[PDB]
Amino acid sequence: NSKFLNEDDLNRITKHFQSRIGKAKELIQLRNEGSTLHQVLKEVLDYRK
Amino acid sequence: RYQCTPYTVEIERMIVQLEKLGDTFQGSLERSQFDRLFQAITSLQNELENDLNKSAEEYMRIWEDVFRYFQTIRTSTADYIAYINSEQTDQRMQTEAFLVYKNQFTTYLRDFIVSLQKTSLQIQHSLSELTLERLQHFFQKLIEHRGAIPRLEDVSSSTNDWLTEYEEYWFSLRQWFLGSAVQQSELDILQWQTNEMIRR
Amino acid sequence: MDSTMKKIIEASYLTADSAAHYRTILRYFYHQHERMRDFIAPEELLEHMRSIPAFADFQEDQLHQQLAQLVKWNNLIARQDMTNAKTIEEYKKKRFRYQCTPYTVEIERMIVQLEKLGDTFQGSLERSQFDRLFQAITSLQNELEN
Amino acid sequence: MDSTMKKIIEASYLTADSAAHYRTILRYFYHQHERMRDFIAPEELL
Amino acid sequence: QRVSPYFVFTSLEKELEDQKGWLDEQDRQLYEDIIVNTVGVILRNRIKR
Amino acid sequence: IQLRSPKLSKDFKPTVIYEILESALPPLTDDELRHLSDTIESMDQTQQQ
């Protein structure tokens, strides 16, 4: 709950996003197919999965 | 024997404010704007929990603090957004002024936007929690203290005018931070403009 | 050179013979700045000046003369549009889009404060000044015991 | 009324040819205001 | 243009000196974090809905 | 269209339904990813240059 949120939790969420962006770049390197970063992002962040 | 009019006093005060500055955009940031504002809103929420038992002046003081901080933040964001969207930033950018703008822009971004974003979540959450109906008895207490101030000013308007003015100001704050189901919050507009200028 | 004694020509608008036009224009600029708006169209200024009855007959050549004078008076900014041409004339005409210098922003900010006021001493007062200073000071004291 | 129609005399101070003597004059007046002094003699000002 | 190696070396020295001043990794991280943070809030809104 | 497609009449166990539902959820419109991806691609391109 936002009510239950605090600066530490905000930092943790940001850290999670940072890890995901690093994972996105690594995926770019592994997928030498040359697909744009937009595609790799749209896959890593698609929450329905 | 001579003295200066308040006209002169205020004029010279603002003149001094300007004289301080290096030409371009040498203003400063007191990063804790949003923390202090949020604290005032937290006081307001605690007042609503108190169930209308406290005295009028407490409500009035919290109101004034909230709106002082909101006014200050609106001034800050106006300065910021004008600095960002300046035609200098846009197409005079070709020169080294891009990098100077970059330095000042990144300073402002870091401090202002980091604090802003960190606060804005709990902010918008509380603002959603700050419904009109709950704020109406709070406005009645504010009326109590406003009558406690028998002003000669145009505040001579009726009590219900004071209620409506409080209410409209509250919508102003709600739109600037929380926004509305009909439109994105002005904070979100600032956010989008900042993002686009970063991309550019 | 100490800047405390030179002629502040930024204020020249306040007593130019067209000070009505200049002041209304700069007030409009301040309001647009308040409206989070940018890249202002001088033609829109002609429109809104004419919408005001005082300048229904507003001459746009005089408008642009005034705009150039204000910019020359370190009160406004502008730059030619690079992309947005629809009529060939627009592509020709280097149509500039404008802003107000921070000089002007602050100047009108102070002016507004005075506009609020009846003559004598209409300033207000929030009595809790002292207790708030005291509260911050008490915070300081509590820090020194930490 | 909105004052923009009328051109303000306080500017005459800031943009007169003697705007130097002026600026200094009411700058000193402001400083005395900060000192909370009263009824300054024109001769002391001189 | 066809220029002697001295000119090219000097030009690359000056250019690399200028180009190196444009950016810094810290600002990269800051910009990325602030945009990713707004994107994270957007994702939060989508999850809530 | 999926509702109408005849795989319903034919296939009878749940894991088809899970894929269908997961496909029903609305994804990330290209704009939201577009800002982040454009900025990150430009920044990494600058680094590579």
Coordinates of C-alpha atoms in Angstrom, one line a residue:
Chain A
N1 CA 0.0 0.0 0.0
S2 CA 1.2 3.5 -0.8
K3 CA 0.3 4.2 2.8
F4 CA 2.7 1.4 3.8
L5 CA 5.4 2.6 1.4
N6 CA 8.7 4.2 2.5
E7 CA 11.9 5.6 1.0
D8 CA 13.6 2.2 1.5
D9 CA 11.0 0.4 -0.4
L10 CA 11.2 3.0 -3.2
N11 CA 15.0 2.4 -3.3
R12 CA 14.4 -1.4 -3.5
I13 CA 11.9 -1.1 -6.3
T14 CA 14.4 1.2 -8.2
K15 CA 17.1 -1.4 -7.6
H16 CA 14.8 -4.1 -9.1
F17 CA 14.4 -1.9 -12.2
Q18 CA 18.2 -1.4 -12.4
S19 CA 18.7 -5.1 -12.3
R20 CA 16.2 -5.5 -15.1
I21 CA 17.9 -2.9 -17.3
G22 CA 21.2 -4.6 -16.8
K23 CA 19.5 -7.8 -17.7
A24 CA 18.1 -6.1 -20.8
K25 CA 21.6 -5.1 -22.0
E26 CA 22.9 -8.6 -21.4
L27 CA 20.0 -9.9 -23.4
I28 CA 21.0 -7.5 -26.2
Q29 CA 24.4 -9.1 -26.2
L30 CA 23.1 -12.7 -26.2
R31 CA 20.6 -11.9 -28.9
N32 CA 23.1 -11.1 -31.6
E33 CA 20.1 -11.2 -34.0
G34 CA 20.4 -7.4 -33.8
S35 CA 16.8 -6.8 -32.5
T36 CA 16.4 -3.3 -31.1
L37 CA 16.6 -2.6 -27.4
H38 CA 13.0 -1.7 -27.6
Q39 CA 12.0 -5.3 -28.3
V40 CA 14.2 -6.7 -25.5
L41 CA 12.7 -4.2 -23.1
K42 CA 9.1 -5.0 -24.3
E43 CA 9.8 -8.6 -23.4
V44 CA 11.6 -8.2 -20.1
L45 CA 9.0 -5.7 -18.7
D46 CA 5.8 -7.3 -20.0
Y47 CA 4.0 -7.9 -16.7
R48 CA 1.4 -10.3 -18.0
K49 CA 4.0 -13.0 -18.2
Chain B
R1 CA 13.0 64.1 7.3
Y2 CA 12.5 61.3 4.9
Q3 CA 11.4 57.7 4.7
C4 CA 10.7 55.2 1.9
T5 CA 7.3 53.9 0.8
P6 CA 6.6 50.1 1.0
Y7 CA 6.5 50.4 -2.8
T8 CA 10.2 51.2 -2.6
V9 CA 10.9 48.6 0.1
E10 CA 9.4 45.7 -1.9
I11 CA 10.9 46.9 -5.2
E12 CA 14.4 47.1 -3.6
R13 CA 13.9 43.7 -2.0
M14 CA 13.2 42.1 -5.4
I15 CA 16.0 44.1 -6.9
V16 CA 18.3 42.6 -4.3
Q17 CA 17.1 39.1 -5.1
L18 CA 18.0 39.6 -8.8
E19 CA 21.3 41.2 -8.0
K20 CA 22.5 38.0 -6.3
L21 CA 22.4 36.0 -9.5
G22 CA 24.7 35.1 -12.2
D23 CA 22.9 35.9 -15.4
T24 CA 21.6 32.6 -16.8
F25 CA 19.6 30.6 -14.2
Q26 CA 21.5 30.9 -10.9
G27 CA 18.6 30.0 -8.6
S28 CA 18.9 27.5 -5.8
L29 CA 17.0 24.4 -4.6
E30 CA 15.9 23.5 -1.1
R31 CA 15.4 19.9 -1.9
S32 CA 13.1 19.2 1.1
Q33 CA 10.2 21.1 -0.4
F34 CA 8.2 17.9 -1.0
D35 CA 9.2 16.3 2.4
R36 CA 7.9 19.4 4.3
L37 CA 4.7 19.6 2.2
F38 CA 4.1 15.8 2.7
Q39 CA 4.6 16.3 6.4
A40 CA 1.9 19.0 6.4
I41 CA -0.5 16.7 4.5
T42 CA 0.3 14.0 7.0
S43 CA -0.7 16.4 9.7
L44 CA -4.0 17.0 7.8
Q45 CA -4.6 13.2 7.6
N46 CA -4.0 12.9 11.3
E47 CA -6.4 15.8 11.9
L48 CA -9.1 14.0 9.9
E49 CA -8.4 10.9 12.1
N50 CA -8.7 13.1 15.2
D51 CA -12.5 13.3 14.4
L52 CA -12.9 17.1 14.5
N53 CA -12.0 17.5 18.2
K54 CA -9.0 19.9 17.9
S55 CA -9.1 23.7 17.9
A56 CA -9.5 25.8 14.8
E57 CA -6.0 27.4 14.8
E58 CA -4.3 24.0 14.4
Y59 CA -6.3 23.3 11.2
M60 CA -5.7 26.8 10.0
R61 CA -1.9 26.5 10.6
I62 CA -1.7 23.1 8.8
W63 CA -3.7 24.6 5.9
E64 CA -1.4 27.6 5.6
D65 CA 1.7 25.4 5.8
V66 CA 0.4 23.0 3.1
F67 CA -0.4 25.9 0.8
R68 CA 2.8 27.8 1.4
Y69 CA 4.7 24.7 0.4
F70 CA 2.5 24.0 -2.6
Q71 CA 2.9 27.7 -3.7
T72 CA 6.7 27.4 -3.3
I73 CA 6.8 24.2 -5.3
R74 CA 4.7 25.7 -8.1
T75 CA 7.1 28.6 -8.3
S76 CA 10.0 26.2 -8.3
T77 CA 8.5 24.0 -11.1
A78 CA 7.6 27.1 -13.1
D79 CA 11.2 28.3 -13.0
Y80 CA 12.4 24.7 -13.8
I81 CA 10.1 24.1 -16.7
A82 CA 10.8 27.5 -18.2
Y83 CA 14.5 26.8 -17.9
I84 CA 14.0 23.4 -19.6
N85 CA 11.8 24.5 -22.5
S86 CA 13.8 27.6 -23.2
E87 CA 14.6 28.1 -26.9
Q88 CA 18.2 28.2 -25.8
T89 CA 17.8 24.6 -24.7
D90 CA 16.1 23.8 -28.0
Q91 CA 18.1 25.2 -30.9
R92 CA 20.7 27.6 -29.5
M93 CA 21.8 24.2 -28.1
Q94 CA 24.3 23.9 -30.9
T95 CA 27.0 25.8 -28.9
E96 CA 28.7 25.0 -25.6
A97 CA 25.7 26.5 -23.8
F98 CA 24.2 23.0 -24.2
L99 CA 26.8 21.7 -21.7
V100 CA 26.3 24.6 -19.2
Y101 CA 22.6 24.1 -19.4
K102 CA 23.4 20.4 -19.0
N103 CA 25.2 21.0 -15.7
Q104 CA 22.5 23.2 -14.2
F105 CA 19.8 20.9 -15.6
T106 CA 21.4 17.8 -14.1
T107 CA 21.8 19.5 -10.8
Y108 CA 18.1 20.5 -10.8
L109 CA 17.1 17.1 -12.1
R110 CA 19.0 15.2 -9.4
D111 CA 17.9 17.1 -6.4
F112 CA 14.4 18.4 -7.3
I113 CA 13.2 15.4 -9.4
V114 CA 14.6 12.7 -7.1
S115 CA 13.0 14.2 -4.0
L116 CA 9.8 15.0 -6.0
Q117 CA 9.5 11.4 -7.3
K118 CA 10.2 9.8 -4.0
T119 CA 7.6 12.0 -2.3
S120 CA 5.0 12.0 -5.0
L121 CA 3.8 8.4 -4.5
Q122 CA 2.8 8.9 -0.9
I123 CA 1.7 12.4 -1.9
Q124 CA -0.8 11.3 -4.5
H125 CA -1.9 8.4 -2.3
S126 CA -2.8 10.8 0.6
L127 CA -4.4 13.3 -1.8
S128 CA -6.7 10.5 -3.1
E129 CA -7.3 9.7 0.6
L130 CA -8.1 13.4 1.2
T131 CA -11.7 13.4 -0.1
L132 CA -13.8 16.5 -0.3
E133 CA -16.4 15.3 2.2
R134 CA -13.8 14.6 4.9
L135 CA -12.2 18.0 4.1
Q136 CA -15.6 19.7 4.5
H137 CA -15.7 19.5 8.3
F138 CA -12.0 20.5 8.2
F139 CA -13.2 23.5 6.2
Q140 CA -15.8 24.2 8.9
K141 CA -13.0 24.4 11.5
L142 CA -11.1 26.6 9.1
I143 CA -14.2 28.8 8.9
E144 CA -14.2 28.8 12.7
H145 CA -10.7 30.3 12.7
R146 CA -11.3 32.6 9.8
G147 CA -14.2 34.1 11.7
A148 CA -11.7 34.2 14.6
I149 CA -9.9 36.6 12.3
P150 CA -12.4 39.4 11.7
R151 CA -10.7 40.7 8.6
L152 CA -11.3 44.1 7.1
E153 CA -10.0 42.6 3.8
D154 CA -12.3 41.2 1.1
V155 CA -12.5 38.1 3.3
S156 CA -15.8 39.8 4.4
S157 CA -17.3 37.3 2.0
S158 CA -19.7 34.8 3.6
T159 CA -18.6 31.6 5.4
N160 CA -19.7 29.5 2.4
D161 CA -17.5 31.6 0.1
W162 CA -14.6 30.6 2.4
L163 CA -15.7 27.0 2.1
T164 CA -15.8 27.2 -1.7
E165 CA -12.4 28.9 -1.8
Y166 CA -10.8 26.2 0.4
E167 CA -12.5 23.6 -1.8
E168 CA -11.2 25.1 -5.1
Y169 CA -7.7 25.4 -3.7
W170 CA -7.9 21.8 -2.7
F171 CA -8.9 20.8 -6.2
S172 CA -5.9 22.8 -7.4
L173 CA -3.5 20.9 -5.3
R174 CA -5.2 17.6 -6.2
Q175 CA -4.8 18.3 -9.9
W176 CA -1.2 19.5 -9.7
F177 CA -0.2 16.4 -7.8
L178 CA -2.8 13.6 -8.1
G179 CA -4.3 14.9 -11.4
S180 CA -7.7 13.7 -12.3
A181 CA -9.5 10.8 -14.1
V182 CA -10.1 13.3 -16.9
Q183 CA -6.5 14.7 -17.2
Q184 CA -3.0 13.8 -16.3
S185 CA -1.7 15.5 -13.2
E186 CA 0.3 18.7 -13.9
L187 CA 3.1 16.9 -12.1
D188 CA 2.8 14.2 -14.7
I189 CA 3.0 16.8 -17.4
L190 CA 6.2 18.2 -15.9
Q191 CA 7.5 14.6 -15.7
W192 CA 6.7 13.9 -19.4
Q193 CA 8.3 17.1 -20.5
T194 CA 11.4 16.4 -18.4
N195 CA 11.6 12.9 -19.9
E196 CA 11.3 14.2 -23.4
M197 CA 14.0 16.8 -22.9
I198 CA 16.2 14.2 -21.4
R199 CA 15.6 12.1 -24.5
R200 CA 16.4 15.1 -26.8
Chain C
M1 CA 31.6 47.6 -11.2
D2 CA 29.1 47.1 -8.5
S3 CA 25.7 46.6 -10.1
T4 CA 23.8 48.6 -7.5
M5 CA 23.8 52.0 -9.3
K6 CA 23.3 51.6 -13.0
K7 CA 20.2 52.4 -15.0
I8 CA 17.8 49.3 -14.8
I9 CA 16.3 49.6 -18.3
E10 CA 14.5 46.3 -17.9
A11 CA 11.9 48.5 -16.1
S12 CA 11.6 50.9 -19.1
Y13 CA 8.3 49.2 -20.1
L14 CA 6.7 50.5 -16.9
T15 CA 6.9 54.1 -18.2
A16 CA 7.1 53.9 -21.9
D17 CA 4.2 55.7 -23.6
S18 CA 2.9 52.2 -24.7
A19 CA 3.3 51.0 -21.1
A20 CA -0.3 49.8 -21.3
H21 CA 0.6 47.6 -24.2
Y22 CA 3.9 46.5 -22.7
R23 CA 2.5 45.8 -19.3
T24 CA -0.5 43.9 -20.6
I25 CA 1.8 41.9 -22.9
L26 CA 4.2 41.0 -20.1
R27 CA 1.4 40.2 -17.8
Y28 CA 0.1 37.8 -20.4
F29 CA 3.6 36.3 -20.7
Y30 CA 3.7 35.8 -17.0
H31 CA 0.3 34.1 -17.0
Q32 CA 1.4 31.8 -19.8
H33 CA 4.5 31.0 -17.8
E34 CA 2.1 30.2 -15.0
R35 CA 0.2 28.0 -17.4
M36 CA 3.3 25.9 -18.0
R37 CA 3.3 27.1 -21.7
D38 CA 6.2 27.8 -24.0
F39 CA 7.1 29.1 -27.5
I40 CA 4.5 31.8 -27.5
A41 CA 3.0 33.1 -30.8
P42 CA 3.1 36.9 -31.2
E43 CA 0.0 36.5 -33.3
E44 CA -1.8 34.9 -30.3
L45 CA -0.7 38.0 -28.4
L46 CA -2.3 40.3 -31.0
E47 CA -5.4 38.1 -30.8
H48 CA -5.7 38.4 -27.0
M49 CA -4.7 42.1 -26.9
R50 CA -7.6 42.8 -29.3
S51 CA -9.9 40.6 -27.3
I52 CA -9.1 43.0 -24.4
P53 CA -11.2 46.1 -25.4
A54 CA -8.4 48.5 -24.5
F55 CA -6.5 47.2 -27.6
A56 CA -9.2 46.1 -30.0
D57 CA -7.5 48.2 -32.6
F58 CA -4.1 46.7 -31.8
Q59 CA -1.6 47.1 -34.7
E60 CA 0.5 44.0 -35.1
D61 CA 3.4 45.8 -36.6
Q62 CA 3.4 47.8 -33.4
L63 CA 3.1 44.5 -31.6
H64 CA 6.3 43.2 -33.2
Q65 CA 8.0 46.6 -32.6
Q66 CA 7.1 46.3 -29.0
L67 CA 8.3 42.7 -28.8
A68 CA 11.7 43.7 -30.3
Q69 CA 11.9 46.6 -27.9
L70 CA 11.2 44.3 -24.9
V71 CA 13.8 41.8 -26.1
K72 CA 16.2 44.6 -26.6
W73 CA 15.2 45.7 -23.0
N74 CA 16.3 42.3 -21.7
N75 CA 12.7 41.4 -20.9
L76 CA 11.8 38.8 -23.5
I77 CA 13.4 36.0 -25.6
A78 CA 12.5 34.5 -28.9
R79 CA 13.8 32.2 -31.7
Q80 CA 12.7 31.5 -35.2
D81 CA 10.6 28.4 -35.8
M82 CA 12.6 25.7 -37.6
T83 CA 10.0 23.1 -38.7
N84 CA 6.4 24.1 -38.5
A85 CA 5.4 25.6 -41.8
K86 CA 2.0 25.0 -43.3
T87 CA 1.6 28.0 -45.6
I88 CA 4.6 28.7 -47.8
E89 CA 4.6 32.2 -46.2
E90 CA 5.2 30.6 -42.8
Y91 CA 8.2 28.8 -44.3
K92 CA 9.4 32.1 -45.6
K93 CA 8.8 34.3 -42.6
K94 CA 11.1 32.9 -39.8
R95 CA 8.2 33.3 -37.4
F96 CA 9.6 33.7 -33.9
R97 CA 8.3 32.2 -30.7
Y98 CA 8.7 34.1 -27.4
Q99 CA 9.3 34.0 -23.7
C100 CA 10.0 36.3 -20.8
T101 CA 13.4 36.8 -19.2
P102 CA 13.7 35.8 -15.5
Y103 CA 14.2 39.5 -14.9
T104 CA 10.6 40.0 -16.1
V105 CA 9.3 37.0 -14.3
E106 CA 10.6 38.2 -10.9
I107 CA 9.7 41.8 -11.6
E108 CA 6.0 40.9 -12.3
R109 CA 6.1 38.5 -9.4
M110 CA 6.9 41.4 -7.0
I111 CA 4.4 43.6 -8.8
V112 CA 1.6 41.2 -8.2
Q113 CA 2.2 41.4 -4.4
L114 CA 1.6 45.1 -4.6
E115 CA -1.4 44.7 -6.9
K116 CA -3.1 42.8 -4.1
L117 CA -2.9 45.8 -1.7
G118 CA -4.9 48.8 -0.9
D119 CA -2.7 51.7 -0.4
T120 CA -1.7 52.2 3.2
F121 CA -0.4 49.0 4.9
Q122 CA -2.6 46.1 3.7
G123 CA 0.1 43.5 4.4
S124 CA -1.1 40.5 6.4
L125 CA 0.5 38.5 9.3
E126 CA 0.5 34.9 10.4
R127 CA 0.9 35.1 14.1
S128 CA 2.5 31.7 14.5
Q129 CA 5.9 33.0 13.2
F130 CA 7.5 33.0 16.6
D131 CA 6.5 29.5 17.8
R132 CA 7.6 28.0 14.5
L133 CA 11.1 29.5 14.8
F134 CA 11.1 28.2 18.4
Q135 CA 10.1 24.8 17.2
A136 CA 13.0 24.7 14.8
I137 CA 15.3 26.0 17.5
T138 CA 14.0 23.2 19.9
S139 CA 14.8 20.7 17.1
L140 CA 18.4 22.2 17.1
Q141 CA 18.6 21.8 20.9
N142 CA 17.5 18.2 20.8
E143 CA 20.1 17.6 18.1
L144 CA 22.9 18.8 20.4
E145 CA 21.8 16.3 23.1
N146 CA 22.1 13.5 20.5
Chain D
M1 CA -8.8 48.0 -11.8
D2 CA -5.8 46.2 -13.3
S3 CA -2.9 48.7 -13.2
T4 CA -1.2 47.6 -16.4
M5 CA -3.1 50.4 -18.3
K6 CA -1.3 53.1 -16.3
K7 CA 2.5 53.5 -16.4
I8 CA 4.1 53.4 -12.9
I9 CA 6.2 56.2 -11.5
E10 CA 8.5 54.0 -9.4
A11 CA 10.1 53.1 -12.7
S12 CA 11.0 56.8 -13.2
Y13 CA 13.3 56.3 -10.2
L14 CA 14.9 53.1 -11.7
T15 CA 15.4 54.5 -15.2
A16 CA 16.0 58.3 -14.8
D17 CA 19.2 59.9 -16.1
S18 CA 20.0 60.5 -12.4
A19 CA 19.0 56.9 -11.7
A20 CA 22.5 56.4 -10.2
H21 CA 22.0 59.0 -7.5
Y22 CA 18.5 57.7 -7.2
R23 CA 19.5 54.0 -6.8
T24 CA 22.0 55.0 -4.2
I25 CA 19.5 57.2 -2.4
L26 CA 16.8 54.6 -1.8
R27 CA 19.4 51.8 -1.4
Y28 CA 20.6 53.8 1.6
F29 CA 17.0 54.3 2.6
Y30 CA 16.4 50.6 2.5
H31 CA 19.5 50.0 4.5
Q32 CA 18.2 52.4 7.2
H33 CA 14.9 50.6 7.0
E34 CA 16.9 47.5 7.8
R35 CA 18.4 49.4 10.7
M36 CA 14.8 50.5 11.6
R37 CA 15.9 54.1 11.7
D38 CA 13.4 56.9 11.3
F39 CA 13.1 60.4 9.8
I40 CA 16.5 60.6 8.1
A41 CA 18.0 64.1 7.7
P42 CA 18.6 65.1 4.1
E43 CA 21.9 66.5 5.2
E44 CA 23.0 63.1 6.7
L45 CA 21.9 61.7 3.4
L46 CA 24.1 64.2 1.5
Chain E
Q1 CA 39.7 16.1 -46.7
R2 CA 43.2 14.7 -47.3
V3 CA 45.4 15.9 -44.5
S4 CA 48.8 14.8 -43.1
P5 CA 48.9 12.4 -40.1
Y6 CA 50.0 15.2 -37.8
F7 CA 46.8 17.1 -38.5
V8 CA 44.7 14.0 -38.0
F9 CA 46.4 13.2 -34.7
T10 CA 46.0 16.7 -33.4
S11 CA 42.3 16.8 -34.5
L12 CA 41.6 13.5 -32.8
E13 CA 43.3 14.7 -29.6
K14 CA 41.1 17.9 -29.6
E15 CA 38.0 16.0 -30.5
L16 CA 38.4 13.2 -28.0
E17 CA 39.1 15.9 -25.4
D18 CA 35.9 17.7 -26.3
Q19 CA 33.8 14.5 -26.7
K20 CA 35.0 13.2 -23.3
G21 CA 33.5 16.3 -21.6
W22 CA 29.9 15.7 -22.8
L23 CA 28.8 13.0 -20.4
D24 CA 29.6 11.2 -17.2
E25 CA 28.4 7.8 -16.1
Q26 CA 26.8 9.2 -12.9
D27 CA 24.5 11.4 -15.0
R28 CA 23.7 8.4 -17.2
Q29 CA 22.6 6.5 -14.1
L30 CA 20.6 9.4 -12.8
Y31 CA 18.7 10.0 -16.0
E32 CA 18.0 6.3 -16.4
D33 CA 16.8 6.0 -12.9
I34 CA 14.4 9.0 -13.1
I35 CA 12.9 7.8 -16.3
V36 CA 12.7 4.2 -15.2
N37 CA 11.1 5.5 -12.0
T38 CA 8.2 7.1 -13.9
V39 CA 7.9 4.0 -16.0
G40 CA 7.7 2.0 -12.8
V41 CA 4.9 4.1 -11.6
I42 CA 3.1 3.6 -14.9
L43 CA 3.6 -0.2 -14.5
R44 CA 2.2 0.1 -11.0
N45 CA -0.9 1.7 -12.5
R46 CA -1.3 -1.1 -15.0
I47 CA -0.9 -3.7 -12.3
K48 CA -3.5 -2.1 -10.1
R49 CA -6.0 -1.9 -13.0
Chain F
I1 CA -12.3 -13.9 -32.6
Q2 CA -10.7 -16.3 -30.2
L3 CA -14.1 -16.9 -28.6
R4 CA -15.3 -17.8 -32.1
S5 CA -12.3 -19.8 -33.3
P6 CA -13.1 -23.5 -33.2
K7 CA -10.3 -24.7 -31.0
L8 CA -12.8 -24.2 -28.2
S9 CA -15.2 -26.8 -29.5
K10 CA -12.3 -29.2 -30.0
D11 CA -9.8 -28.9 -27.2
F12 CA -11.1 -29.6 -23.8
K13 CA -8.5 -29.0 -21.0
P14 CA -7.6 -25.8 -19.0
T15 CA -4.1 -24.9 -20.2
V16 CA -5.6 -23.6 -23.4
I17 CA -7.8 -21.3 -21.2
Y18 CA -4.7 -19.9 -19.3
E19 CA -3.0 -18.9 -22.5
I20 CA -6.2 -17.3 -23.7
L21 CA -6.7 -15.3 -20.6
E22 CA -3.0 -14.3 -20.5
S23 CA -3.5 -13.0 -24.0
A24 CA -6.6 -11.1 -22.9
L25 CA -4.7 -8.8 -20.7
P26 CA -3.8 -5.4 -22.3
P27 CA 0.0 -4.9 -22.9
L28 CA 2.4 -2.0 -22.9
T29 CA 1.7 0.6 -25.6
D30 CA 4.7 1.4 -27.7
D31 CA 5.0 4.9 -26.4
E32 CA 5.8 4.0 -22.8
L33 CA 8.6 1.7 -23.8
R34 CA 9.6 4.1 -26.6
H35 CA 10.8 6.9 -24.3
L36 CA 13.0 4.7 -22.2
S37 CA 14.3 2.6 -25.1
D38 CA 15.1 5.6 -27.2
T39 CA 17.0 7.2 -24.4
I40 CA 18.9 4.0 -23.4
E41 CA 19.8 3.2 -27.0
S42 CA 21.1 6.7 -27.6
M43 CA 23.1 6.7 -24.4
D44 CA 24.7 3.3 -25.2
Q45 CA 25.4 4.4 -28.8
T46 CA 27.1 7.5 -27.5
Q47 CA 29.2 5.3 -25.2
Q48 CA 30.1 3.0 -28.2
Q49 CA 31.0 6.0 -30.3

